[PDB]
Amino acid sequence: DPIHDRTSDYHKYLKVKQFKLTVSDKRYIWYNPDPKERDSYECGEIVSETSDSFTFKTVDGQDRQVKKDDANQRNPIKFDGVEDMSELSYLNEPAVFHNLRVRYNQDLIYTYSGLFLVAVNPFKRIPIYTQEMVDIFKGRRRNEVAPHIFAISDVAYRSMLDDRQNQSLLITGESGAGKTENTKKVIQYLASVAGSGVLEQQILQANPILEAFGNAKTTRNNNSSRFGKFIEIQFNSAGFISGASIQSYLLEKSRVVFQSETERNYHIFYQLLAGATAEEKKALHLAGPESFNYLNQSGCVDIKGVSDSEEFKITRQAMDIVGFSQEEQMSIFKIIAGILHLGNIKFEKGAGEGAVLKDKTALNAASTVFGVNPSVLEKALMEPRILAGRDLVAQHLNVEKSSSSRDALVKALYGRLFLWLVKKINNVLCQERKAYFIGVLDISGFEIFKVNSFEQLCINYTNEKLQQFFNHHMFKLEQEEYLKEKINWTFIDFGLDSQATIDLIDGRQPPGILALLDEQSVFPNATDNTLITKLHSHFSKKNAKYEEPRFSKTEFGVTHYAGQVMYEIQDWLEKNKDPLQQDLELCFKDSSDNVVTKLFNDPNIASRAKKGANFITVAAQYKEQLASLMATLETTNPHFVRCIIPNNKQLPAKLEDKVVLDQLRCNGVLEGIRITRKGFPNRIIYADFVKRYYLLAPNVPRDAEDSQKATDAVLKHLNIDPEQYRFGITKIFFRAGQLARIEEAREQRISEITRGLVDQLIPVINKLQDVFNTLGSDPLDLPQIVVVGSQSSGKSSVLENIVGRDFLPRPLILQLTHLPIADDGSQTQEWGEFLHKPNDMFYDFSEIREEIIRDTDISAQPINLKIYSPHVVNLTLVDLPGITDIEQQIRRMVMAYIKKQNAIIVAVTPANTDLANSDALQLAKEVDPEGKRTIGVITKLDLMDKGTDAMEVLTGRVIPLTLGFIGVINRSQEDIIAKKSIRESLKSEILYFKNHPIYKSIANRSGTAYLSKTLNKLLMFHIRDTLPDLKVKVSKMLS
Ligand SMILES: Nc1ncnc2c1ncn2[C@@H]1O[C@H](COP(=O)(O)OP(=O)(O)O)[C@@H](O)[C@H]1O
Ligand SMILES: OC[C@H]1O[C@@H](O)[C@H](O)[C@@H](O)[C@@H]1O
Ligand SMILES: [Mg+2]
């Protein structure tokens, strides 16, 4: 399984490479050392914070302060390279960019951002698109695998099948950002998982055909799409590919006759001249690109790394696969060559005003490959006949007009040829009946150049609709979640903000730009000036999205979603009408070539108005085509892929701050995470919230049964403002920022209780004990001292002796803290504290005995008693019930305690009860065979017998132990009856051992004083010894 194998290409090319921050409490923030350079950011460490402001040290070396509102906090370095950025506490611009940068530098181009898939063009080849890679993502769910265009393709596929609903993938981005490469990957994936099959190959081979005729090298992309497309992959009810259909939009026909410096014409022109066979060159009258006007003006005829001859063979192969016949293929090449020959026709000024054609070479070459009459073609170009009432009069045209008519014929032939290719492909691939489909939209994003004409308005208008579509989708998803979870919050439709710009463009009443253009396009003597004049007359200072420039008399502004765009009105009338002399239509309708003739006869191709319809302008046609695409998209469940270009030099490993950030700002990527920042952007299933923040509140099990009640407990203890959150049916909902503040509390808390893990070790362990061992569990295997003895062993007296005062009547965690002599030199009064009584102080030890009895009315939940006294040593002990229905759980509890090797066992045993067949030591040796962590305490020594001595065990012989034995004596029953108090009877204990015939030799290693000192010592060093392992355990359970 490659997904788990680290030594697999999957982990190498799709997975990110590979306690310090745990104890650390450092905070960092993104800032720009130069306020005027918003795109350049640096990391600064936070040093202090007030009510609503931060203070940090800049790398330059200088404290700086910023408001908490404008602060761009940085996420913990642990999250650098996350697969899905939606799980970040901070999603500010610099933070987003940073995670993308981290991934990009590791050659990870794919990153998730909620319902957004981000892909940053690598401008390099990364082996993550092989079949094996396809197989790896098959079936896999998003969370189950790393980010990849294949993963989102699978999700859409699974959704189609599971919900029986059509899907769509919208791949958007700037020119060269990677839309088409990713579009091909989706198809590659779908053909594989739902598929080397005839139909499959045909679908796969259709793209190569359209790219040859619709792509070209521009200054921003060597393989630029000069048309947009919507590919529908069809499936049968069983989920197998059954067909495909293609729609093309806004083909850049003007490129056929003109290309700006360094750019090329459509690939097919160069492919034909370089890949045609010798026989084809002759039949077509071909020559090198330099001999053709339409190819020798840009200064570029080839692309580095690209072989046009090789690509030609590929295109021819693709046409064979899709099914174009040999003759159809030849006719397509004749059209391409004919267009080239038309471009070489040179019109000259005749004796008069009319143009003439002196050389007939180009005209004839064209006429021969087109299968039309040269004489008729020549007259149709320079002397088209126009209707003068009821007679046709030959209008002899000058040079400029003849040349323009030639170009119009060229564009019309290319445009029609392209539509014909698409229609032919659809005839072979499209099936009238299909159960479902997955549509992929590959079209240009907003276009804002210095010069913007009609084409740009169409594409911008398109993107206004697509952005509106996305916002509205987000709206619906949000509305659906709040409804399902029972969260009362209503948003204003996100898409309503695009309506104004859209109406200004395609509105009927009031009439928008297109309507006014159409009207003006059919107006008698209308000109580009009367047009601009009319637009200003309708929207200047009357529509907030429109702007009449201050000086320019040929432009107008439109405020688009992505910013204002200035449009030049020049040629708009001609563009909207796309005229072609009727005599040219007639000339080609009489062609001897089958395909040429279809380009002028097929109504669905030869014109915009279908058989029986009225006049249709280009604008009206495009508005109808766009509404049809939107209606289709609105019948699907949409998936969005955001492509980002790393720089403007088409170079690998060179992510530029300004270039990327600019896109993240208009791509909507930063919008798709700030659109709902007004409601409750964050929500977490209760059990998950509790599992993570239980640590911030007392008495809250990481796995409480009632997750919702626990969640409520945490928020209350943290004193969170009730308005900042809402309780859903399955999730807790938070206002923007609130969850991030709770996460920061968790981080600070973690640091507060783990930093000590690096003397006063006893207290540090005491803290962890109060935080994790209250419910009676020891998940961290805390190093502790456990006291074990019989109900009559008199162990409780031992504890009261160590405490130096009576206070004893569940496990009992006794945490003693020594109090130093007062600063003035006085003796501080001793008192106690219970963990379940947060604000109480027990100065009366009698009340402590009572509280123990109260809270107790056998259980595994320990009572946590803390005692602060200047008469005790620093020490922590865990007293367990002494050793039937009840005597079954007790032994169970004890065992569960001494079982751990991180525990030291204090076995208390009466001296007046032999040594063999003990009790505590028995259970002790059971879990501690080598007796390396057991210390025996011998009590009631003064209660043995006449000549009964115990020096044998005290010196460690009857039963050896690494830690040894310690003897002691306690108060008698009549002593308790009298005034005789503890730490008074201790004075006696010392004299007993000091003046004892045999024990006097070991007097210094006996008694309560010595026992307490020893336990403190054993605990200090045991904690120190266990410290390393405990750090590992703590790090784990906290992640
Ligand atoms: N994921 C990718 N892997 C390799 N090269 C890529 C990738 N995405 C883009 N490219 C490179 O970028 C060029 C332009 O990408 P393209 O998809 O054609 O952009 P767009 O369609 O958005 O105009 C490609 O032809 C290729 O050289
Ligand atoms: O003009 C009526 C409608 O026509 C459709 O084609 C457009 O997409 C809508 O935006 C418009 O409101
Ligand atoms: Mg493209």
Secondary structure blueprint with pairings:
Elements: H1 9-14, H2 20-23, E1 27-31, E2 42-49, E3 53-58, E4 62-67, E5 72-73, H3 93-105, E6 110-112, E7 116-120, H4 131-137, H5 149-163, E8 167-172, H6 179-193, H7 198-214, E9 215-216, E10 224-225, E11 228-235, E12 241-249, H8 254-257, H9 267-275, H10 278-284, H11 308-322, H12 326-343, E13 348-349, E14 355-356, H13 361-370, H14 374-382, E15 385-388, E16 391-394, H15 399-429, E17 436-442, H16 454-485, H17 499-506, H18 513-521, H19 528-539, E18 546-547, E19 555-560, E20 563-568, H20 572-577, H21 582-589, H22 594-601, H23 603-606, H24 618-633, E21 637-644, H25 657-666, E22 682-685, H26 686-693, H27 707-717, E23 725-727, E24 731-734, H28 738-754, H29 761-772, E25 784-788, H30 795-803, E26 812-818, E27 831-834, H31 845-856, E28 863-869, E29 875-879, H32 886-898, E30 903-910, H33 920-927, E31 934-939, H34 951-954, E32 965-967, H35 973-977, H36 985-994, H37 1007-1037
Parallel strand pairs: 7-21, 8-17, 8-21, 25-29, 25-30, 26-28, 30-31, 31-32
Antiparallel strand pairs: 1-2, 1-5, 2-3, 3-4, 6-7, 9-10, 11-12, 11-17, 13-14, 15-16, 18-19, 19-20, 22-24, 23-24, 26-29, 27-28
Helix pairs in contact: 5-6, 6-7, 7-9, 7-11, 7-15, 9-11, 12-13, 12-15, 14-21, 15-22, 16-17, 16-24, 18-19, 21-22, 26-27
The chain binds adenosine-5'-diphosphate, beta-D-glucopyranose (BGC) and magnesium ion.
Subunit structure: Myosin-2 heavy chain is two-headed. It self-assembles into filaments. Hexamer of 2 heavy chain subunits (MHC), 2 alkali light chain subunits (MLC) and 2 regulatory light chain subunits (MLC-2). Associates with elmoA.
Function: Myosin is a protein that binds to actin and has ATPase activity that is activated by actin.
Family: Belongs to the TRAFAC class myosin-kinesin ATPase superfamily. Myosin family.
